[PDB]
Structure 1
C-alpha cells in the first residue's frame, strides 16, 4: 500500500480496554515522531484495530518497518499504511 501519515494497525488483543490500549500504543510509537492522535474503537467493526496519525509521513514509515509483528498484549501487531488520509490530515 501507499505510504501515508496514518498507519492502520490490527490483530490487537481485543480484551484490552480502550483507554489503556490507547496509552500503551502511544508509548510504543512516540519514539518515531510526534503523534497528532490515535483512533481506537471497540465497536464490532472497529475492535482489534487502531489508526495512529503521525505529524510526519517519514515517521509512519520507520514505525511501520520497526514495529511489524511486535509483541503487544500477547499478539503480534500487524501494521500497514492507511488506505486513505484521516480527516485531520485531509482537512489540513
Structure 2
C-alpha cells in the first residue's frame, strides 16, 4: 500500500551533493518522456534535501513514471518513488 495515484510523484534517496539547478535539469530530462511536466520542486534545506517533487499534467503520466523509474540509478543512488501524499498547490488550485 502506502499511497493512492496523484499528479505529483515524490522522489527520495537522491544524491544530496548535486547542485539544485543541475538536479532539476537531470530530473526533467529523465522524466520528460512520460508526459508534460508542470514543474519540479527541489530544495537543499535540512528537511527537503535529497528529495524532489515532479508535478505531472496527467495522473497516468505520474503512474508510468513511478513504475518505470523505480530504483533507476541516478547520480549513483537508486531512486525511490511514490505518489505524493497530497496534491501540489498548483494542482489543487487548478
- Give TM-score scaled by structure 1 length: 1.00
* Distance in 2, Cα, partners of 1:28 & 1:79: 14
Q: CA deviation at 1:75?
A: 0.1
> What is the match of residue 56 of structure 1?
58
For the residue of structure 1 that corresponds to 2:34, the secondary structure is: coil
Q: CA deviation at 1:8?
A: 0.2
CA RMSD for the aligned pairs? 0.2
- Give TM-score scaled by structure 2 length: 0.98
* Distance in 2, Cα, partners of 1:58 & 1:29: 13
Q: CA deviation at 1:58?
A: 0.1
Q: CA deviation at 1:52?
A: 0.1
The size of the alignment, in residue pairs, is 92
* 1:35-86 deviation digits (Å, cap 9, x = unpaired): 0000000000000000000000000000000000000000000000000000
For the residue of structure 2 that corresponds to 1:31, the secondary structure is: helix
Q: Unpaired segments of 5 or more residues in structure 2? A: none
Q: Unpaired segments of 5 or more residues in structure 1? A: none
Structure 1's consecutive aligned runs of 4 or more residues displaced over 2 angstroms after TM superposition are: none
For the residue of structure 2 that corresponds to 1:44, the secondary structure is: coil
Q: CA deviation at 1:2?
A: 0.5
